[PDB]
Amino acid sequence: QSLQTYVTQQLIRAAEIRASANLAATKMSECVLGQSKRVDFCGKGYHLM
């Protein structure tokens, strides 16, 4: 029971970390590899670099 609870908690944390990593990859692709016109996606203000 304890081990299954730990595995379920790890799976939920892994899903959260997926969401965060997908966001990080999108920001790397948009903000670093180019200039993004999306408001507040890359910092506050008009994004430059």
Q: How many residues bind a copy of itself (CB under 8 A)?
A: 44
| Residues within window 2-31 making contact with a copy of itself, judged by CB under 8 A | 3-8, 10-30
Shortest Å, Cβ 22 to a copy of itself = 8
Shortest Å, Cβ 31 to a copy of itself = 9
Looking from the CA of 47 toward its CB, the CA atoms found within 13 Å total 16
Q: How far apart are CA 22 and CA 4, in angstroms?
A: 27
Q: How far apart are CA 15 and CA 32, in angstroms?
A: 25
The one-character DSSP state at 40 is T
Positions in the binding site for a copy of itself (CB under 8 A): 3-8, 10-30, 32-41, 43-49
